[PDB]
């Protein structure tokens, strides 16, 4: 790639994941939101219930139930195809930071970024590559705990705006979040998740501005290969921007591990005291 600029076994195994039919009330009248592979509804077990369009559904549930971490969205269970997830009071992280009625500080936003890094450190330790890390795909609960979501049976295209169709393969991909090598090969790794995490940090510090306005296709590759990266946000401290630049290192192997990112971001986080309010950039308001 160009990196220089130019079944009894499965049935017994799924017992601890399955929820009984009469121990789950799905409120189909109350719609939370729409995805490409299923609609999400309110439910009582209080939870979020995604109704999808069989062995793979059961298998995917077992793998997902094993992932347990405070910064990763847990699976409460499955039902037969219903995916029972914990309800996130404050919705997705992007809409939360964009909301004009919220008054985040620099500390708050770096804190959210640290939480995501902890979630990804856990997932990477399980050899799980996310492939679509972005603020829209993380969620926020009633204690403002950030949960990396949009994986396993919860995987979807929740905002169709930010997925572009590759002209040869037809795969709808989040090109603005993708590593330079993934744009060229459509292969994903933990090191490409790190690139995406860098873009997510940029989203946090811009309070949810779209990365690279008007560069929406795989021609982002040409743009990047001119020798470009996302600019430093006005309220992004210098050390955090240095971290973003490390996340976007041309060589995948030279990018920091999520372990390293948790370390570095924890240090930067600890220097702030909640005195710097982050305001939205006038040139990004209403921009898609």
Ligand X SMILES: O=C(Nc1cn2nc(Sc3nnc4ccccn34)ccc2n1)C1CC1
Angle between helices 258-270 and 106-125 (to 10 degrees): 160
Q: Classify each residue of 107-118 as buried b or exposed e, where b means 16 or more C-beta atoms within 10 Å of its C-beta.
A: bbbbbbbbbbbb
Work out what residue 276 binds among ligand X, Cl ion, none; the CB cut-off runs from 5 to 8 Å by kind: Cl ion
Q: Does 154 bind ligand X (CB under 6 A)?
A: yes
Give the other-Cβ count within 10 Å of 216's Cβ.
16
The answer to whether the annotation marks 38 as part of a ligand binding site is yes
Q: How far is Cα 262 from Cα 268, in angstroms, rounded to an integer?
A: 10
Q: Does 236 bind ligand X (CB under 6 A)?
A: no
The enclosing H or E element of 231 equals none
Site string for Cl ion, 78-117 (x = CB under 5 A): ---------------------------xxx----------
Q: Does 276 bind Cl ion (CB under 5 A)?
A: yes
Work out what residue 202 binds among ligand X, Cl ion, none; the CB cut-off runs from 5 to 8 Å by kind: none
Q: Any catalytic annotation for residue 132?
A: yes
Burial (CB count <10 Å: 0-12, 13-18, 19+), residue 254: exposed
Specify the residue, 42 or 166, whose C-beta has the smaller distance to ligand X. 42
Q: How far is Cα 43 from Cα 177, in angstroms, rounded to an integer?
A: 32
Give the other-Cβ count within 10 Å of 12's Cβ.
9
Q: Does 210 bind ligand X (CB under 6 A)?
A: no
- For the four alpha carbons of 78, 79, 82 and 87, in that order, the dihedral sign comes to negative
Q: Does 237 bind Cl ion (CB under 5 A)?
A: no
The enclosing H or E element of 47 equals strand 47-52
Residue bearing tokens 């450190």: 121
Site string for ligand X, 47-86 (x = CB under 6 A): -x-x----------------------x-----------x-
Give the one residue of 272, 280, 281, 284 binding Cl ion; rule: CB under 5 A.
272
Binding site for Cl ion (CB under 5 A): 105-107, 272, 274, 276
Supply the residues annotated as catalytic: 132
Binding site for ligand X (CB under 6 A): 32-33, 40, 48, 50, 73, 85, 87-88, 91-92, 137, 139, 149-150, 154, 158
């Amino acid at each position: 790639t160009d990196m220089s600029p130019i079944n009894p076994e499965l049935v017994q195994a799924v017992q601890h994941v399955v929820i009984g039919p009469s121990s789950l009330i799905v409120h189909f009248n109350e719609v939370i939101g729409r995805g490409h592979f299923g609609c999400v509804y309110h439910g009582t077990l209080h939870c979020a219930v995604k109704s999808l369009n069989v062995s793979q559904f059961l298998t995917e549930g077992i793998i997902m139930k094993d992932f347990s971490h405070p910064n990763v969205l847990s699976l409460l269970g499955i039902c037969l195809p219903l995916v029972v997830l914990p309800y996130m009071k404050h919705g997705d992280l992007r809409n939360f930071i964009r909301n004009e009625t919220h008054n985040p500080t620099v500390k708050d936003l770096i804190g959210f970024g640290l939480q995501v890094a902890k979630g990804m450190k856990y997932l990477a330790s399980k050899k799980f590559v996310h492939r679509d890390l972005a603020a829209r795909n993380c969620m926020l609960d009633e204690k403002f705990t950030v949960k990396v979501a949009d994986f396993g049976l919860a995987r979807d295209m929740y905002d169709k705006e930010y997925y572009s169709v590759h002209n040869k393969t037809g795969a709808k991909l989040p090109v603005k979040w993708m590593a330079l090598e993934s744009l060229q090969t459509q292969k994903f790794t933990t090191k490409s998740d790190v690139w995406s995490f860098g873009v997510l940090l940029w989203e946090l510090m811009t309070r949810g501005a779209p990365p690279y306005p008007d560069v929406n296709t795989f021609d982002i590759t040409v743009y990047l290969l001119q020798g470009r990266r996302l600019l430093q946000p006005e309220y992004c401290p210098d050390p955090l921007y240095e971290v973003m630049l490390k996340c976007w290192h041309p060589k995948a192997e030279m990018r920091p591990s999520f372990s390293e990112l948790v370390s570095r971001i924890s240090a930067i986080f600890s220097t702030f005291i909640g005195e710097h309010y982050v305001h939205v950039n006038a040139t990004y308001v209403n921009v898609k």
